[PDB]
Design an enzyme around this catalytic site. Sequence first.
Site, PDB file in Angstrom:
ATOM      1  N   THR F  27       0.833  -1.196   0.000  1.00 38.03           N
ATOM      2  CA  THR F  27       0.000   0.000   0.000  1.00 38.03           C
ATOM      3  C   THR F  27       0.869   1.248   0.000  1.00 38.03           C
ATOM      4  O   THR F  27       1.430   1.625   1.026  1.00 38.03           O
ATOM      5  CB  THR F  27      -0.942   0.025   1.207  1.00 38.03           C
ATOM      6  OG1 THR F  27      -0.172   0.079   2.414  1.00 38.03           O
ATOM      7  CG2 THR F  27      -1.802  -1.226   1.219  1.00 38.03           C
ATOM      8  N   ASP F  43      -2.408   4.597  -3.008  1.00 35.99           N
ATOM      9  CA  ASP F  43      -2.994   3.484  -3.741  1.00 35.99           C
ATOM     10  C   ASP F  43      -4.362   3.137  -3.165  1.00 35.99           C
ATOM     11  O   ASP F  43      -4.650   3.395  -1.993  1.00 35.99           O
ATOM     12  CB  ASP F  43      -2.079   2.260  -3.705  1.00 35.99           C
ATOM     13  CG  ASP F  43      -2.110   1.546  -2.371  1.00 35.99           C
ATOM     14  OD1 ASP F  43      -2.085   2.228  -1.325  1.00 35.99           O
ATOM     15  OD2 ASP F  43      -2.165   0.299  -2.372  1.00 35.99           O
ATOM     16  N   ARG F  45      -5.953  -0.060  -3.574  1.00 32.32           N
ATOM     17  CA  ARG F  45      -6.188  -1.488  -3.404  1.00 32.32           C
ATOM     18  C   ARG F  45      -5.783  -1.899  -1.994  1.00 32.32           C
ATOM     19  O   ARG F  45      -4.646  -1.657  -1.574  1.00 32.32           O
ATOM     20  CB  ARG F  45      -5.417  -2.302  -4.442  1.00 32.32           C
ATOM     21  CG  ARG F  45      -5.882  -3.746  -4.547  1.00 32.32           C
ATOM     22  CD  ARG F  45      -5.075  -4.528  -5.571  1.00 32.32           C
ATOM     23  NE  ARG F  45      -3.723  -4.812  -5.107  1.00 32.32           N
ATOM     24  CZ  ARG F  45      -2.838  -5.536  -5.779  1.00 32.32           C
ATOM     25  NH1 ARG F  45      -3.127  -6.059  -6.959  1.00 32.32           N
ATOM     26  NH2 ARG F  45      -1.635  -5.742  -5.252  1.00 32.32           N
ATOM     27  N   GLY F  73       0.146   1.419   8.395  1.00 35.83           N
ATOM     28  CA  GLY F  73       0.172   0.704   9.654  1.00 35.83           C
ATOM     29  C   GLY F  73      -1.204   0.194  10.018  1.00 35.83           C
ATOM     30  O   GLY F  73      -1.958  -0.232   9.140  1.00 35.83           O
ATOM     31  N   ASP F 192       5.563  -4.137  -6.830  1.00 39.84           N
ATOM     32  CA  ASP F 192       5.305  -4.681  -5.506  1.00 39.84           C
ATOM     33  C   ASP F 192       3.912  -5.292  -5.484  1.00 39.84           C
ATOM     34  O   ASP F 192       3.016  -4.856  -6.211  1.00 39.84           O
ATOM     35  CB  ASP F 192       5.438  -3.603  -4.420  1.00 39.84           C
ATOM     36  CG  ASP F 192       5.331  -4.169  -3.019  1.00 39.84           C
ATOM     37  OD1 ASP F 192       6.250  -4.904  -2.603  1.00 39.84           O
ATOM     38  OD2 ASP F 192       4.330  -3.877  -2.333  1.00 39.84           O
TER      39      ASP F 192
END
Lengths: 205, 191, 249, 236, 186, 218, 245, 142, 241
Positions: F27, F43, F45, F73, F192
């Site tokens: 993220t 992002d 998603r 986090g 990623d």
Amino acid sequence: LKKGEVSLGTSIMAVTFKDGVILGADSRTTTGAYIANRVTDKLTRVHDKIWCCRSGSAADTQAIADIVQYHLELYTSQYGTPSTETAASVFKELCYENKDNLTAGIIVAGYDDKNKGEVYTIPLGGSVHKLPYAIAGSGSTFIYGYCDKNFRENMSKEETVDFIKHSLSQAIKWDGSSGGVIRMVVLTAAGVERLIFYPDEYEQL
Amino acid sequence: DIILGIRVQDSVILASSKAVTRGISVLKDSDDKTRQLSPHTLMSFAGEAGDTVQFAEYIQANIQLYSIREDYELSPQAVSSFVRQELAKSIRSRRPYQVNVLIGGYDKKKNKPELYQIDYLGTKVELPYGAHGYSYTFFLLDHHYRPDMTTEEGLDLLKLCVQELEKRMPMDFKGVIVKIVDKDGIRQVDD
Amino acid sequence: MTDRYSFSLTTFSPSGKLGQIDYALTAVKQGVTSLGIKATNGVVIATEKKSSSPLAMSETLSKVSLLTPDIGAVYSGMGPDYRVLVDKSRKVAHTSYKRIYGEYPPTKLLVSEVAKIMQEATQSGGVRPFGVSLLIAGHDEFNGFSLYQVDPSGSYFPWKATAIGKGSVAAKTFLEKRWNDELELEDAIHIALLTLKESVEGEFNGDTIELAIIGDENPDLLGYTGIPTDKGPRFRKLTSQEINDRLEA
Amino acid sequence: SRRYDSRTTIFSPEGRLYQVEYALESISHAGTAIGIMASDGIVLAAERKVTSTLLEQDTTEKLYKLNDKIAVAVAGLTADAEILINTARIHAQNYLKTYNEDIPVEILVRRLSDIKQGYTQHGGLRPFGVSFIYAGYDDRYGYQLYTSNPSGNYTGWKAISVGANTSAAQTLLQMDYKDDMKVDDAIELALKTLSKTTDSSALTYDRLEFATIRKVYQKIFKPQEIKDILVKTGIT
Amino acid sequence: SSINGGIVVAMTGKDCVAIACDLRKFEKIFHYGHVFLGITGLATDVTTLNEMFRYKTNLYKLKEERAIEPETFTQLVSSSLYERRFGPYFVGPVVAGINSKSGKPFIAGFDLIGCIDEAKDFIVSGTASDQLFGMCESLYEPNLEPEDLFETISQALLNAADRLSGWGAVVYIIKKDEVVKRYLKM
Amino acid sequence: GLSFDNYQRNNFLAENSHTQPKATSTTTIVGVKFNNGVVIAADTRSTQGPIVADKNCAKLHRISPKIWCAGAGTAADTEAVTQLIGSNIELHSLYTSREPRVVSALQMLKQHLFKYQGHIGAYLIVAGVDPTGSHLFSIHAHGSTDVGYYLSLGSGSLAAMAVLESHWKQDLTKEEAIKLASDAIQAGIWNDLGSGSNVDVCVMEIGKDAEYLRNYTP
Amino acid sequence: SGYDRALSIFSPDGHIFQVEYALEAVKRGTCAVGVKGKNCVVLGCERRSTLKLQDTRITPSKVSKIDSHVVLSFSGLNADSRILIEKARVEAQSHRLTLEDPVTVEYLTRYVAGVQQRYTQSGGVRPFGVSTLIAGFDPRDDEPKLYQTEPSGIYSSWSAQTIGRNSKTVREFLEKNYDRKEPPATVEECVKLTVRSLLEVVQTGAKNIEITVVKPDSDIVALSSEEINQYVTQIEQEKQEQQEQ
Amino acid sequence: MNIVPQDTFKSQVSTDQDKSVLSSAVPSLPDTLRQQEGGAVPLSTQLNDRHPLESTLKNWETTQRQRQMEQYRQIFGIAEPMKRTMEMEIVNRTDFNPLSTNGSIHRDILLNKECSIDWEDVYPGTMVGDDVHSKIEKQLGI
Amino acid sequence: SAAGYDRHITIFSPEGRLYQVEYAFKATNQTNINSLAVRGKDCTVVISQKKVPDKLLDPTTVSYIFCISRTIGMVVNGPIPDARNAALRAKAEAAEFRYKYGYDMPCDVLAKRMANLSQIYTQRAYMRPLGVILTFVSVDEELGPSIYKTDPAGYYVGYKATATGPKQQEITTNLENHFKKSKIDHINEESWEKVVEFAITHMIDALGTEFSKNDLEVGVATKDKFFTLSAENIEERLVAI
């Protein structure tokens, strides 16, 4: 040091010369092997002509610096411009009384019309020491001998600038957590002066 | 520490084994693992020594205080809910202790028996029958349980369960104290 | 120990009346006149901006304050009490409702909280009751527009149109004959201006009276764009230029 | 005497609490509330003494709801009444959470009365100076009607009245009340008593609050319903 | 005795919602007016949450003089869960409802500390990786009639149960006007 | 405040037979500062472990109409801390009758995070504009703050930082800054597994209303 | 004079006037009589005439059972009696929990007296204007116990004691009709004596009298209206027969 | 001059440490019934297995207040902390609201928290006790 | 004069007034000195009258102007003990604001804070108001030159120009006439020295009989620093008309 925090692995120097003091540092903040911030201003100011550099845990040092600036503002409102000794005493008390919870180390540089520039160091634990010059950080261990072989009392401004530049360049060269540019603050009777030196200048020394 | 409770059409039968202590020889005729919460509500408990008896006596004192204050008897459902709340509150700020509670009553307003079980975490469940202790007997209860059984049939089933438990136990299983809660109140069976 | 307690400042009189509350009401009745009018499209809150010294900047002190983006208030009585109560109400609107239900409180619930705070000062051992009266105008989704009046005793009542202060009786008499169920927001503003015109002894312009409205949303006042569901604030304080324009017309 | 009335924690030489008596006297400055218990329901009526024009009569100053089965009629200061009503609602919810049952009416009445009595036994606290008429239903006693005064005392009644004209209303109820009346008869009797004891020319709909509790649910009458009932009863 | 654990499925129809839970009494779905909540996890924490939410919704209805909307209830549940930040309940809740003023169906899910997970198609709680989330995704079609949504959710429950023994299910179909409760004693 | 009840019970359950349910851990997040404002992108998603949970997640939080932040986090901790600081900022702005400043929000966040000694897992990027100009800061979960021109955070922060180091200069326009932030988020998405789908953008300029864009890539 | 404005001020002659004023407040309450028998204790209470519209199902009773073996009646302010009774019940349950034994009558009397005394030790508090009669039997004991407690915190043990309004007449009647050497042997004699003592002040009779009888092994019985009416009628008939000749 | 609170642990324990809740039959032992904690909560269990952050959070504003008072004493003199503490004590002692727990407005003004919210403000959170009389006895010391 | 109570504490009189607050207001004029505050184009000037009846008193130790912070200056009308108490509290409040919110305290916020404290004093029964009037002058970075006055009643307000003292009516009327004539809510001068000279001239023509360098006290607030003039500076300003 609590797990997962940020460590202030750096190269901190403070040198007293004929007309005042100069405080120098690098600009690298790393988290392990990754450089989190390659442009960092580590020359924390706590009063108009009283500056400091921090090491240990970033959060604890920032909290201590904020409290010290608050204390010095109260003092200035009451009695006027404080001396570097008072700021060093406040730093020492804050670091010593919380040494079982906070990991912090400070280098304090100051100037006043009476003492004409002073350097104090509060390492981990809370003790205070007054020295003609001070070095600290992970990268300092590589320049100790050098700093012991090229320091003279009552140097001119240019000589002190060159000495700090050379020592910090060597510390940057030999330490993995030290790099970037060199930032220096000159505290004299005239005022506060800012100096920045780029890698292409000190790497040719 | 084995406790059993069987709910029949007109009453609730609670059976408890004799309490013993490690390395200590005791001869007595008493029921120290059962407290009478109200003339029509009985409670049986099994768990760690000390904490369980303190909790049971605390619950009994609270319920007796309510009965005196209101000049009225709480329903078994309200009693079970209060016990569950107090048990959840007991381990709110401490390590939980082993405790299992069977509450059997006869609701006069509904004119019907009821049985509840609460574990050490404070999970209250209404059951047709329940047991705690040895972990064998649920199959025997399942194959020989009817919602319309009489008191005598429930007592026969309890005798069969007690005999089965005694057979597996290495002959150290002493007698079982049996109590019946019904419309006439709480009584003890000496058979 | 005699230091563990303090006797109640407000006590019943032999006639059954709390003297401190009545004296607070008397202090309220000596204040500058404020008023509120409820219309089908909004609620108008208006007051007179008194000025002891002509050199004082009138815009630095505002008798009309934004409680929530949909709820505003005006006071009559003692200014410091108004300021303290406004700060407390703004804090309570967030501590009690928005941090819990994720939305701003309705008008009635906020008024009830303010009334409870005001009442707690009438049954205490060392604080006198607040010497202010409150007119709170708000809008909520499930109740439309509302106007409430809160007394120093902590009692609040809903009003179709009301006024407090020195000329409260005359303003109420004027508003009794100039209110109807078909009134509009602009008509309500005009009626409020006319009612205030009869109470101001001195200069009557846009710099001596203050007005605010609870009407439709103002998406230009949000400060950000991109979220259609974020409704703009409905409380709007009319500027002195708009007041002057309405006075000319 | 004036030497024994400045504090709530001092007895007069005759053994009287003057502040409590003043709080009781303050009740007669409020509107009249009447509660009548029928054989199949409870009727609560309240007269709006401080109601005039330009007031939103659609949106409740004397009749309040505590839970699905208990309601109250208020006579006195409204702010203290709201404080006590919120406390009673919290107590009822606590009882429901603890025992998983609806709280009996008498327990809640006794709790509020104990709070009122406690407020008369501290130097820094003045009596609330409110009177409550509780109308409730529970599975123990059925329908029940209670009253509580600022002193902390509560009593059970078949037909009770508080407010400004308590004596006349009580006399009218004593003359007209019957133990076998239905809800409609109780409504008619309450309306007649309010009309007889009112200080206004007519008993219009804009100065009345009405409520019923009957099989079990509550019903707070809207102004249209109040007007229809007034027309039916002949008061108009 | 056991009881701990379970599955909750929430799906959105055209102008209706469907919320379903498994069953061996003890039902994991509770209603506070026209808002439904299903909690998976420890039975003790489920009962505690049910009692607390009944308390808070009763107080809300007494004060606001109106029923509580699904969005407001979602925010309330999130805040209540976050209150026990360091002692959180071992639960996963799912909220379903119909907004009585706009009619738009609402479904949302939470973690154990009240992080709101609002999905526009369907939400699975308890087990969302073995045989439930994938089958629900395969069987889902947007904008279904209430009967079609009921059939879809029953088929999803049967497929999850297969992947036989004593099995039951409770399904609630919620419209703006009436709510239908059905069992799956199959 | 926050309750510590059932701590011992939870420890006992974890140590004996039960597993505590996990919490959503959010993220890529990026922030780029241009000559007359800032841009904050994230992002969209969100994945529950190895399984994608949503293809459109709003990870941009609002503190003030011109002060925004994006957090990584624990999602619940990030949201709660941001909402609390936003309430405090709104109350302070009402009290002072002035536009809130980024430094005030930074101070509040730093002190609140240092109060809990890192037990609140929120790592934030806070951007905004105020009468003093445009500001961009990074806040650690233990209460340490840093100042920069371009910042990246999250699982795919290394690819985003590489993109930022590739194509950043002092003089940038709004469109160029938005494109650079989008490119950094796209690189984090592609290289990623923790990022995907669309991008949420918020642009704050001096003297203008904040512009919020959802699904900028389509 | 000026020495009656606080509980902490002694008068020059050595009196605390606020205690006397609390006793004066007590004297206005309804009469309450307690009679100790050979094997029972009888508590009688005078009730005000119930109004026509007053409910007669839920009215609190004058006599309250603190514990299954101990009862308590009061005279004075009715609101403070509830607080005292609740505290006594909670203390009885706490003592049973802590020591596994039900309280003795003297222990509960001492606790109530201690609470009343403690509520007289501050200038920001008001003492309870209630005087109480506590009756019962000690657990597994056959000795009747009757005690009187006053607002100042002083308690005493009596064989027959009347408190409240017009209690002097009843006290004189008991002194002239009760002898400690010959307590009534049966419960009926004690009830008859209590009724005859109450009838000295009660204007109406059977409808303003409440009687509770306590016997060992926790036997507490509250007499109904019919039984008290029978006692009253028998007493009136005997009085008429005696006055005829 | 402390930032993180220190010395939060108990040094001695006893069966009568809680003076408010003590038995009357045995004054040297606590009253379990009136504690209303669960009935199976010995005091020793409170000395072990506590969350490390609970003590830090429970006494945090007090530590900052003490540090501020120490700074005032160092810079201004005895008079400034004396006056601050006197004002705060007067405000705290005058207030007595048995039916509420929320603090007064003047207390927040003195504490400089008029427009500040923490989780304590958002989350302000029987058979025996929790009534007016118990609070009166606790306040008056009787 | 209060009839029963209100001679000791602050509660409502039957007329609905707080007599103690009014008496504290009356106590502010005991010093019999006047102060005047005006706004320049980018500066603020405060001028106060010094009286030294005792020749043994050291003139340099007599002052009613305080430096709360680097940008904010304060002028107090009333007795000097409460003046110093208020000065110390204002210093503490400004420093605490700077520590807590990360930027310098504006003048209006400090005035509102002191007003809230005054409201506390006026409402609490066991606290008394301070019989002083405070005037904070500064150059806010968002509002330019600023003057804000706070009274014992808890009321604060900003002024284009202000004057407080036993003879405040004359100075206020003269300032109002000047503003009506020039039709400007401030002074159109780019240097603070000219504003100081204008304020001295206004004070001279308001009070009358002029004054020397030892009968005046001048403080100037700019956008960088607030400072207080000395005897030589005041005398040099006096020379220039």
